[PDB]
Each structure stands twice: as C-alpha cells, then as structure tokens.
Amino acid sequence: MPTVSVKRDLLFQALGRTYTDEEFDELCFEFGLELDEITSEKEIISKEQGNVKAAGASDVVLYKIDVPANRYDLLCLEGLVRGLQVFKERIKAPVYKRVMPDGKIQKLIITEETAKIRPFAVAAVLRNIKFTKDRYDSFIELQEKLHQNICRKRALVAIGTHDLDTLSGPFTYTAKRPSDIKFKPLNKTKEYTACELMNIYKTDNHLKHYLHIIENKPLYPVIYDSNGVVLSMPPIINGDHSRITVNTRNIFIECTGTDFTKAKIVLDIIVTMFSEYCENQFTVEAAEVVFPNGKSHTFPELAYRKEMVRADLINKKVGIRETPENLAKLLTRMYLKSEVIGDGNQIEIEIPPTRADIIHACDIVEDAAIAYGYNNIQMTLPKTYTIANQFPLNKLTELLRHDMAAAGFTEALTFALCSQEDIADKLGVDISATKAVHISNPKTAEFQVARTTLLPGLLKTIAANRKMPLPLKLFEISDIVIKDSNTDVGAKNYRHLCAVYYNKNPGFEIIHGLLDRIMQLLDVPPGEDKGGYVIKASEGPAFFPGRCAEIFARGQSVGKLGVLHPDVITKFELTMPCSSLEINIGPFL
Amino acid sequence: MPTVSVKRDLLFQALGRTYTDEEFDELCFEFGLELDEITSEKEIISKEQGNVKAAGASDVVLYKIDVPANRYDLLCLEGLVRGLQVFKERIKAPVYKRVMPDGKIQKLIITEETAKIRPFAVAAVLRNIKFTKDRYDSFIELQEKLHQNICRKRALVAIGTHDLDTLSGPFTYTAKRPSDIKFKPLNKTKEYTACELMNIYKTDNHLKHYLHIIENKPLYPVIYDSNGVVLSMPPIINGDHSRITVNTRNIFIECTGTDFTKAKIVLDIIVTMFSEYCENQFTVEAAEVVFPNGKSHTFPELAYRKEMVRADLINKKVGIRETPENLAKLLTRMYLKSEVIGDGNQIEIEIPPTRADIIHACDIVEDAAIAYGYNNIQMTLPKTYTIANQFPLNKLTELLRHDMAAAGFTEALTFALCSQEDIADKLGVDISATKAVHISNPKTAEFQVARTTLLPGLLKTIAANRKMPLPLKLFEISDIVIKDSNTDVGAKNYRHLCAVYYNKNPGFEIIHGLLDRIMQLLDVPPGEDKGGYVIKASEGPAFFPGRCAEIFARGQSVGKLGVLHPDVITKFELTMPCSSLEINIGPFL
Amino acid sequence: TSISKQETELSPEMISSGSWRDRPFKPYNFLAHGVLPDSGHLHPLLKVRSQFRQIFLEMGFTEMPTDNFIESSFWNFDALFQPQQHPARDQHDTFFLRDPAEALQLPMDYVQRVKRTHSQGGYGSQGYKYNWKLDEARKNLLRTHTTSASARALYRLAQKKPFTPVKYFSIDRVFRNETLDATHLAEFHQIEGVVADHGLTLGHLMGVLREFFTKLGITQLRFKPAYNPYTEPSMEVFSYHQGLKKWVEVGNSGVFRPEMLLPMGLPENVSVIAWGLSLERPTMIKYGINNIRELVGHKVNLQMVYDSPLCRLDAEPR
Amino acid sequence: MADGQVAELLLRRLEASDGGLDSAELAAELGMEHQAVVGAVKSLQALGEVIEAELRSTKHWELTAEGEEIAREGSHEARVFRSIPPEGLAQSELMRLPSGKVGFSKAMSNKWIRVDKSAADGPRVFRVVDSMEDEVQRRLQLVRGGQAEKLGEKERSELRKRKLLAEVTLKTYWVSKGSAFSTSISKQETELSPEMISSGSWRDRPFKPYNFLAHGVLPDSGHLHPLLKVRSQFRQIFLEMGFTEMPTDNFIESSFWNFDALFQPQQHPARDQHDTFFLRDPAEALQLPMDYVQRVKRTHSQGGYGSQGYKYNWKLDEARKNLLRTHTTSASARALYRLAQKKPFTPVKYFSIDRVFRNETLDATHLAEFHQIEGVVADHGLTLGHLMGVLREFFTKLGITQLRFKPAYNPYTEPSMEVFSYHQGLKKWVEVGNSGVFRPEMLLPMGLPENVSVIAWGLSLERPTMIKYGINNIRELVGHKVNLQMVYDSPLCRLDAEPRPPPTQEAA
C-alpha cells in the first residue's frame, strides 16, 4: 500500500481549488485513493524517538494519501495532481515527446563485464529543470518511493540522477574488482574503495540492506565518463561529484538492473513525471545507450501503445449501457485518450506511457468503470439456478461437533503451528518419527512445525485455563498435517476429532465411553464381525502404561485412546492427570 | 379410491389376451390404475367368519383394481376394458348415439310436488339388452358403485333401472304424503306404506343410512305409470314389480335428485356403458322428460363437446415437443377424439360423454401426458435463481433445540391433541379457564382438546418411561393452541420451550438454572432495569406453594417456572417430585 | 504374593513426585462399554425434519410459516378447488372444531371469486356445477394437510405489485381423524415443496423431484399418473426397495389447477408445481421400525432416542 | 414487625378462633392496616400448606375526581355547546383553553356543532342542531345517587375509559386453619421427597420457602466455540444462496497454485520470506500440471490470451517452492481449473471457509494464522454489477444494508472492488470485504472458455466475529490462550447474528 505525503496547501494550490477535509476524502474515494490520515512530522518524531519537537517547516498540515501499488504515475504530488486533474476534466492530459538535443547526444555505453551482475541499464536527460525546495524533495521522494517498492529495494532496478553540468563526455557502464575503484560517495568525508565501502556500510542503518542483498560477486557495477569521473556504483551509492541539488539545471538519469522492461519503465515514470518542470515543458532529451551487443538504442522509449476495444464489450463487462461516444469520454478522463471510430461501434484507445499497467483488454474495463463511478452501476443478480452441496467431510464434522457439545464437552481453537517439542519431545517421541512438516526460517520457536495432533494444543489450553472449574472437557475436530509421498505437494491434511478429560482423577473410563458414544453416533457396531470397531490395548510413549489402547475400525487403525503419561502432563505444566482420545474421522465417511 | 373387482379369466377374455400378474400390474400403472390385490371369494371372507370355506365362485381368481375417483367410465369391467382397449389402440373408440324409437316414445312427467324434495330427474331406455350372469352383476355393481360414491350415497342423485316389459304408459314423478302410498318393495314379503317402510327400515343394515339422511319432509318422491303401478320411491327402494333380472329385455332407467347435471351424468355413464349389450349396439333409446315447467327435453343428452387447444399449449405445459398430428393421436387414445385443424396449429378435441372429468383445458394436458407416458418426458430443471430464507421463529427454535441438548436435556414428541382433564383438571384448573379449543364429536377421550401446554405430554412421557435411569431431563419446543378473538380463524399457535426435571428430589434450582442459561443464550440480561427479565415468585394451581415463579421479559409475562404440585404428579400416575419450566419463546425473536 | 497391592487410577501427587513409578497398578478391563458420557438428545424424527429443512434450503427454497393448527374449511378446502361433495370434508375423516366452530374473518372478495368459479366456472373451466354454501366454508377444523398453507402463501404472493417467481417449502404437523392405527396415527408431520414460475412443465416438476430425492439418497425414480383435486396433471413418484423387494410410493405431486390459482389473482402466464410426503414414512424405514407409536408420542421409548444416531449421516455414502 | 411478627400473631388468633378469620376485621381489631395482615398471609402459605385462605372481594362503583365535576356542572361537550351562540364562536378562542378543547372534540363527534373558514376571523364554530340533552352528565348525576346499577354495561363501559368514573374492588382474605398449622415454625423442611408424595406428609409440615431472588444453577452444557458458531452461520448463508462447498484439505500449497496460478507475478513482494511462511521439509512440490504450468509460464512472461504478460523470466524452480497456503484464493484456482476440464462447461457457485497462514508480525490483532471465507461465481456474461448484486444479497443475510463499493487492486482481478458499510455506533464507513473479477490471463490458461467469466469475493471470519459477539481484540478466544469462561457464556450468535439484537437499557 504505497503512501504519498503532500503539503496540503500546496496540493490544493497545485490543483487550483480548496477542499474540505471531506470534499477531498471524497475525491480520493471517487478515484480509488484513500486519505489515510492528516498529521505531520509533529506526530512522526513525536511518538517513537524521545521527543524532538523541531517545527519550522516539519510540523505542517499534509495529507497522507494511499495509492494503488498498480498505478506508478501516482507516487508523487506532480502525478496525483496530474491524474486527478484529468479525471475531473479540469485539464487536458499532457503529451510526452522525447526530443533530440543540439549535438550533445549524451551517450552511455554498456560493456561485457556488465551482463552477469546487472545485465542492462538505460538512461536519458531532461533539459533545464526549474527546481524548488518542494519540487526537489518531491523529485527525491519519488525516487525513493519507486525504489524500495516497484524495484524491490533496487534489487531489479536502480535509478541514479546526476547533475550533468558537473561531468561530461560519453559515459561508461561496467564492472571491475571491488578493490579497484576510488570514490567520493554522497555523504562520505573522504574518498574510499568499493572493496572498502561495502563493509563500512554494513553499519549504515539505511544501506545496511541494499548492499550484500545484491552484491558480493567478482565484479561491481560502475559508471564513468570522458574525464574518468565516477558517476556512481549503481545499487549502493552515487558519486558526490555528480550530486543533484535544488540549483541543478540539467539532470542525467541512468537506470541499471537485472530486469530490462522494469528499468525501462522506472525511467519513463521519472522522466515523464518531472518533465513538467523542464523549460520546454513535457519534453525529454533523448539519450543513446549502447549495449555490449554494439548496437545503439535511443531512450527513454516513451511507449505509446494503441490497442482497440469494442464498446459493447466495455458495457457487457462492466454492467452498464452507455453509448460509445460517452464511453470514450470516460476512458479519456482516465488518461486513455479514446475516440469512437465512425460506425459508433469500436473505440480507439491510446495507452499513454504513464499508464504501463494497461496490459490486457480488461484493464481498460477497470478504468472505464472507475471513471463511471462504481456506485452508479445498477446492482443486478445473476440468474442461474444451482443446487447447493456441502462437502461430505465437513457435513459430518458439523454434526459431530453438535453431539460432542451435547455430550457435555467444550470446543476449542488450537493453532495449526507450533514448536517441535510440542509434538515430539513433550510427548516422548523424536521429531524424526512424527512425519511432521518443517517450516523454513521460522520467526518464533512456535512456528517450526505444523500440528501432527490436536492433543498438544488442547493441553496448552488447559494450561492457560487453570482458573476453570473441576473437570475440563475439551475437544476439537480439525486438521493435522503429515508428509505424504503420494500427494502432489508432499503433505496431506487429516480430520481428527480429539478430546481430553482433565480432573482430580483421569476419566479414562468416561473417555472410553466417549469413544463408544461417537461410534454409536456414526452407527459403527462394536466388534469386527460386522465391519465395526474395537479397542485393543496397546503401548504409547505418551500414555501411562496399561491405560492406553488403539482404535480399529473399517479395516484400519483410527486412533489412540489412553491416559496421558505423567511426563507429558508435567512437561505441559499441568497439575491433574489426563485422559485423551483422538480418532481420524476420515475413514468414517 | 374406487375399487373394482373383476373375474380375471373374464377380464382377459374381454380384452383378447392373457396377462402375467406383472404384465397387467404394469398395464395398470401405465394407465394410472393400480392392481391393489388378487384374491378369491373364499379368501375374501376367510377372515370375516374365521374360515367357513365357502366354495363356488371362490375358485375363480379376480383382480381388485383401483381407479381414480375422477374417471367414472371406469367403474365396471365393461368400462375398464373399453378404456384400456383404446389406450393401447387395440380397438377404435365406439360412438354413442341416441335414437328415436318406433312410436313408444316413453315419457316421464315431473310435477310441482317435486321441486322441494328432489327438484329434477331424468331418464331414458336401452332396447333389447343381451344380459348375462356376469353382465347382470356388473350392471348392478356399477349402479351401486356410482351410487354411494359420485352421488354421495344417493344424496344428490339416485338411479333406478326398471324392466319396461312389466309396466306401460307415460310415467309420473311426484311426491305425496308418506302414509299415502301402498307398495311392494324389492325384498319385502307383503305390501307396505311409505310412512310404514321408513321405520321398518331403521333396522335394515343396508338402507339404515340412505333413508332419514335424505327424507322426513312433507312429501316423498314416487314414480307411477299409466296402469298406476308404482315404479319406485327414488332414494330408498324400487318396486318389486318392475324389478330387473338376468332375463330382462328392455330397461327403463330413471334418475332423480337435487343436482341436475350430476344426475344427467350418472345417466350417461350407465347408458353409455351398457349400450354395448343392446341389439343395436351402442345406441340409447331417447326418452322424453317433461318438467313442472311444462316443457319437454329429450334424454339422455349424450353430450359431445368440441373444444380446441393449441398444440403448442399441450407441449409447453407437459414438457414435450411432439407434432400436432401426433398430439392428436395421443389425445384420441385417451377417448378424446382429436383431429388437427388444417394449419397444423390447433387441435379440435371431442369430449365424449363418458369422460365427464374433462372440465378445463388443463385436463386435456393430463390425458395427453398420460397417453405419452410420464417416463418418456425428459426431466428438466427450472432455471430461476432464488435465495433461500428460513422462517425467523423456526431458525431460533432450531438453535435452542441444539443448546437444550447441549445442556443435557432430551427432546420428546408430545401429541397436539388430548383430553380436557389433561390440560385442566389434572393441573388444578377448570377447562373453562384454559382458553382451550374444543374438537367436535371426538372419537376417543384424548381428542377433545388441543394442547394449551407441553407440560402434560411431557409428564405422560415420563409415565411411560418409568424404566428410565435416575433423573429424566425432558424438553420440547413446539406449538400450543389458544382461542384468540383477533385472528381470522379464532385461535392462535404459540411456541413454548418446555422442560422438566424428574428425580428423587425436584431440581427446582437446576430448572431455575436452565431458564438462566436459556436467557443467557438469547442474550437477555437479568433484572427489572436492564430491559431484561425477572423471576417474580407467584402462585399456581399446578405448583407446590412457594416453589413457583413467573417469568417476565421484554415487557410481558413469558412463562411459569416452578415445582409440580403433588396432586398433578400423582394424577399423572408418577412417583418422584418434579420441576418444570415453560416460556413462550415468541417475544424473544 | 510380593509387591502386589495394586492401586487405582493415577494421581495428581503421584504425578507430582515420582510416586506413580513403582507402586504397582495395572488393572483395566479393555473389553467393556466403558461409561457412555451423560449427553443431551434430539428426537430422531426431528433430527430428520432438520435434514429435510436443509435439503430445501440448499435447493433455494424459502420456508413458509405454518403457525395455525386450526384452519377454516375455506382455506383448507374450497380455496384449493376442493369441491364440497368430496368424501374428505366429512365428519368421519376430519377434525372440525366445536368451540371456534365458524371462523371469524374471511377474504370475501377472494371467497366470492372462489364461490363463483366453484359453481358456475370461469377462468376457462366449467366448475363443479353445484351450489357453493358459504356457511360450509366457515366451518373451522384441524388442518388436514400443509397444502392449505401453500394456498395461503400463494394467495399472498398473488398480491405482490409485480409477480415474482418463488420456491416455498414447509414441514408441519397435520391432524387427521382417519383411524386410530398401528401403521399410521391421528396426527403426523407432512413436508411440502412448491415452485411458482413462468412456463414450468411437468418435466420441471420431475427434474426438481429428482434433485430432491437425490439429496435424500435415492436414484431409482419412476413416475406414475395420479389424481389430486387440485392439480392439472398429478403424479406419484416411486422408488425401488428390497424391503418389499419392489417399487414403492415415496411422494405425491402435481401442478395446481388454474381454477385454484387464477381466482387468487395470480397471472395466467404463471404456473406453479408442488410435491409432498410425510416425515414419518422415510424414518419408519431408514431406521427400521415396527410400531410408529414407538417414536411419535408420549409412548415413545426414550432409550431408543438416547441411542439414535446421526439421522443425517444418511444421504451421505452410507 | 410486619410479616413474621404479625404472622406468629395471626396464627395465635386462628388458634383461639372458631375457624373463620378475616385479614380485614382482625386487622381492624388490631392496630394494623390491611397491607400488613395480608402482606403476611402471603408468608403463611409459602411456609408450606399451613393455613388455607380465600380471597373474597367487594365491588362498588365510585365517581372520578374529573367526573364528579361533570356530575354537577355538566359534561364538557354540553359545557361548550351552550357556550357557543348562533352568532358563531371563533374556534380559535374556543380551543385556547383545555377544558374547552376537549369538549370541542366531542361536540364535533356528536354533530352538535360544525366549523367553517368563511369569516376573516379565522375558522368559526356554529351549532348544528338546537336540541341539547346532556346525557353524559345526567347519567353520572345518578351513578352518585347510589344508583350505579340503573345503568347499562354498554354505557358505564365507555364512560369508564372517559375517566368519568372507576370501579373499586376491596380484597378481603379469609384465612382458615389448614394442616401444617402450628406455631412451631421449623421450616427446616428443605425439599420434597418421593415419599411425601405417596403418603401426604407434605401436608403435615412447613417447607422453607424458596428465595426467588438469587440466580439458579447453570447446568453443565457442552459448548461450541464462538468463532466456529459464526463459521457455521456463514456456511449456511452460502448454502442458502445456492453455493456448493469446495474442499480445502491442504494447509500446504505449492507456490505454483498459490501465486503463479492466480497470475500473481513471481517477483511479487507477497511471496517474500517476511510475508509468507515457506517450507523447510517438503520444500519442493512432488508434482504439478506441467501442461497447465507451461501455459502459465508462457502467458506469464510472453503474454497471450489478449494480454502482454509481465514480460519477465518465469523460473519453474520458484513455483516448485512449497509453502503454507496464504489465502483461500488458491483453493478456488484449483476448483476452477478442475471445472475447466468438464466435458461441456457448466456454470457454478463455489464457497469455502478455511484457515490461511501469513508470516507478518503485523499490527492489528496479532494472528499469523486466521480464517478466511471466499465465494466464487462462474457463469456466462457476469458483470461487475452482478458481483455487486450478489454481494448485497450476501451482506444482507449478514444484516447489513449500508453498502458502498470502492475501486481497488488485486493482481488477479480485471476490475476489483472493496465493499464498505457505515457503522452506527462506531460512526464511520468501515470495510467489510474485498472482491474482483478474475483476470482472463488467470482463467484462460486453465482452459475455461472465453465466453465464461468468474467473479469472486472474500473476507475474514475474525473481523465480523469481533463485531458480532462484540469485542475489540480476538486473540481473546482464538488460540490456546482463549478464555474458556467466555466460551461457556457465548450466546447464540445466529438469531443474534442476522436478526436485530437488543442492547442494554439506557436509564438516565
């Protein structure tokens, strides 16, 4: 859920109106956005770090707007204002054209040492930007916004903005040994080496992540220029020499990474977003990127796709019956400049490079409906008769639940995850003989394995309810996982009905009687000479010897009936003795 | 459910084939009939006299066929054979025409003394019937069959068949004082008076009914002739002079009654049925009936209606898509002679006087489908989506039921009817203060009144389960009726949840606790303030003093909580004491 | 013997400090019914009613109310185009009330239209051509069948601004003065389902029936023609059984005649089909029974109730 | 000294008397009223069956405070009739005084006077007739003549509610001697043995009367967990809406079905170690629909079916990664794929309520595993409006009408919408559910026809249960830390989970 903070007064000024805290909260809703909150850093630093009451330009009235992780052209104020502006037809949607410069055909060359750490990269420049205190921060913000978001913390794509007036001549993208590049990084006193920064950063709260999470290979990405100046070391930090500040006139933007198209997009977003501030408004100065391939492609490629969709489709899909001429109007307000094609049947839609989310015909429908306003769509009810059916298992379960309750027991809600010791050690068995499934890199200890039985959880429940009266009679009918070599995934769930008797004395006879009831309920006759069930004394490492049995029915072992062994009852920090029961109700269907 | 017995060998001979006891049981099914049972005359009495082995016509096997109280043309063998015969297109359906005789235009005159006891009557004759041992009995049987059936025990219509060779000259239908007509009745030794037979019959097992159930007015119907001979006294008995026997050649049939059309039909059935045995086969000799009106109408009026149905209708209604030409074929086999009308759209149907059941367009559809064979109709499923909804009350009930069970109680199934003493005297109250509803002319004593409480039945249940363990904990959540001056019918049902505790000691505290649970379940807080409920000690003629309370909630009296009074517990033949509870769950919705 | 003075069940103190160890106690008869835990109980017949109620809900049917053990003869009979000559409106078959003899309020307009078509005909029919006495319809009684409830339901429906298709059902008690018996009783439960839409066919009635009896676990379905005063075509559905080793009637159904519906005010383009059966029959077999009075009534053998199992683990793969 | 003191004294008296005794007379003979003697007689009955008592009563007719006035100065209607000349009497002033006002309403409902609006002086009142006879008054005028009987039941009837007189009934008690009679009073007789019933010994003793104040003994009923009691209700709503229950027996899902199958890109954040619990043991799926997988891999990277894919490289080794089902949507993917294989396509309605597992140590109720219910409809030409329509019907059987939809985003839905509801108490539009319309790049590769479209929606069993049983935090009953006592007490959240439940009174 990408959030975008914006100076209110500015936002309003940007639009050309003043909004009530409702009027805007409404406009947000109307456009799929959400006005999450209205506060300021007077609430930020004032809530988790001592109390630095620093307010001179921090404590303000800014809106905390939530935006769909889908729309990228909405990660900065420039974008939200542009979007909402066209959405309410208060402005015509701007066109983004990339132009050729006057000889200074800036170029960035990719080498061979590249393809294996950050395969490709792309760049472009935007001439004479009239920056501002805010415009600057917005430009930097957007950069961060789509970095640790759409780029997956720079992992795939990394963007670098440079002050073109502080370097010149063809730039080079390549990779050299770590300890083979001196550098004067953004906020660093001296001038260090790549092999040197890497570890001096393992302590940097911000970059502590980005680095190793991406580099520790035989080469490191780097960008040079004619002079031999180091532009930046792509994923980690940029050069302080080419740093960009409020007074920068020309910006050279470069994007390197493992995912071509994404980078290609990130560029377009950045450049298309801020070209609103270039002298030659909404223009991006081409740039020539030369691949190891030896070929030269121009960037950014402000892609303008032109797919076609039939009007009847939009209607038949959304659930509205508007005319093609009006449908076009809708789509337009959404940035997708549409125009009806003569026979008022088909609508020609122009997909701007800003809305890179439109990838299928249906995506147009989305925008179409959003423009039309969801709540203006008449609710209709699908007229197809279908007979409902419960899932055999669950039906039975639902029944047993009602009788367990009739039989005086109380249903619980055990978690499905826990610690190995819960389903092994504490029960007198090694985690190697449980057939249990193991969770990778589990947060807590109680996230190691997935239930193999309901007995643990049930006990643990008693443990937390010591405050409860004389005999506790718990039960639960849920699933337990097991490894199964014969299932597409590797594991299988089983429906166990598990109950427990907690009292001064274990109710092993009353628990034995529960099983008898259950069987009686399932119409399963006692004895085997009729395909029924029987109790055959047996031994269990979790049951006090000689007070443990096995349940057999419909030609197989169903469960274990018995009195919990003093060891398990203490290892689960309990007082009284305990009688349990756990049958797999599966075979009884 | 009219049943028709037929000599098997005869039936088969009649048809022109021999059938398996399955082959025929099948044919029956196929035609809406049912072969109820197969026995002999000996077996038929082999239980009403012990086993007085009656040999003779008990050697013959006869089928006991069940026929729809709708089809009248199927009350005799002649009819069933004719019907099935055409149904299997093994024979063309016969036409019934009424003809003029040779001068002997028999006539029956109705008088004024008529209209007020048996308003109208109608008659007709059938020339030269070739009777038979069987044909005769069948003719008499049919007479009885449609008498105490479609005529409602002669109440509306009464039929009389006479041997026209034993009387002559114009007949008269009228009414004279009871003690004003000598007569020589069917099976009577001498010659009695009307005023005399009436009471000498109050002892006749057979006519014991018909008589008074219809006559005791200032006049009695009677039918004379030229000679002055008495034909019969319509509803009760016919004249022995004009009796009809196996050797009769000409029959004069007369039908008198209160319901014109029905009589008119009964005639048609009789005459149309047996004209199969007249010399001039399937012909009925006209008869002139003259009304008090002075006008003369000819009978019987073998009505032949000709309605028209759009083949599309039959298809769209039955659920089949056969062609009009074939649809007609179907209908025909069913007696309804049909023919397509040029533009293969409409079908002209001729309704025979035999099928008087056809009264609406839909009745044609029935026959059409039956002819087509139900099981040849493809099963389709109505495609209209509908969201299901339970009835508020019942939903709640279903829930409480599940919790009463959870609370260890057992649900019963009390009857809704009983004896007054069950809901009054045995509870210490007069049947005049129960608001109970009373049943008219109840068979047993336990069919006098309808429940006013569930307590009685519940106790009565305990009474029958003395054999059951220590404490009995019963409950039921059903309806009880009460008179309500504000309901279209006069009474209203109420949903009471009623429970009882039967044990060495009454569980008045545990019953009190049940009510508390129940309220807790219904989320109803206790105390007079919190808009909840209150137990206010009170007095009840069914509860042991000082161990009785009243339940108040949602601004009204809900029920009575208390310990049954020793009197009621003994008057219901019980041993131990008892604690009850009965709340009207209605207000809790 | 030596160390043989066995103990009873384990103890919270033995579990406290090693005591349970060797203080020898191994006696437990592993072949005994154990102690059935005391448990609450729901009546078998109602456990079944529950299952039916569900089937209906899963099939999109709405539950219509039946709070009225006492119905006026009009609604129980006349309204369903049930003539007054019929042998089922006799004192020897029905329970007519003695106290609230005549009802109070009656839908006179609707009643007029009934009286009419009942005797003179109309709506395309030729009535029964008899004289309809209102004093008769006024006679109160004990609902003889849930069909009356449907009559009510349909009439109400007929009054809705624009017509709207529906699916109603109801499982209620119904009084009959038949014959104090061992096979059948005086009062039992009868379930009824009704569908009202445009252009429903006999086949639909069949189709629905198949779907219904399937959720009841029945496939051997065969239909047979029949008669009901209130249904254009009427059919009884049958299933094969081993018990009587041959076909058995498991339900009666039909297609309400228009002389029943039209006078209520329903549109001519609407047609309604319905079917019904008794809650008793299906239990007195799918649980094997000899005497009905064994589970319905005060003479019920409670022990049988305590033991009655999941009378819903039925329409499952038994 | 009120019951117990006047009791042991009313017993003395009965002892000294010849049978008969009145709670009035003997209360007149005493220095005590009748709210003491009678107030006590109550105790002398509770205390077993000591003394018999018969509630006799006197019934006479009195006149009202109001009606005593009428009784002498005439009724209110007659009052006003005479007060209004023929010259008219502006009804303005007439009703500018209560005494009149009333009488005007009845001189009207008598046809004694009528109105008009034909004189600038606003409406006016003129007498209709000229013959006046004050029945009301001349009827009371005699009821107080000790003649309160010469009047019809049809008359005093109406007169009664008119507050023009009331009936007085003086209740007298005739306490006799019963059986248990004895001044010993040793109510040590606690209950009622089966013996006493067959004998009669309940008559020869006093039984300690019951204290109907204290609550009774709640029986040991079994219990069903609140969250599941709710799961049940949802399950039902779905069935009543024609939905079939799809199976979910698989806490462990292969990454393919959970993410890829749903056209949720591989490099999606949601399939990160911080977001989803992956597996250490069956870390690799032992099998999967390679054909279907191929069609996925394809459209996923190169596109097709009308889409332009995500233009990235789809690694199969990734999809092979096993995990803990993060959402029930995977179950639907399965279900739909299966459906896509049916000979001819057949429309359906599926639903399923099963627990999912998310790693997040996230805010809100800290639950790494919670239940999620999902409903899906697949037919021909379903529209966003249908999705809406179904949603309205669903949330209605949940008792909610304040429904408003909002645009949203789900990787696997062409249009997607979140649906909200305005909360009364907690005034503010809260959410309530997320839904969408599965993208064709999800469906088409499964093999479903292009003319078929499927819509779906979902929510958590937890959120609503919190606002139905009424709570704020759920880790209060979801887990081993659950407060069992809260379960024992959890009420029917069924009738109180759809119909309108009553909230505690508001006394001021």
Ligand SMILES: N[C@@H](Cc1ccccc1)C(=O)O
């Ligand atoms: N229970 C009803 C159901 C039904 C209605 C209408 C016609 C047929 C059947 C009956 O037995 O008739």
Ligand SMILES: N[C@@H](Cc1ccccc1)C(=O)O
């Ligand atoms: N699975 C989502 C709901 C959803 C599923 C599929 C499509 C749209 C919405 C949830 O449980 O919240």
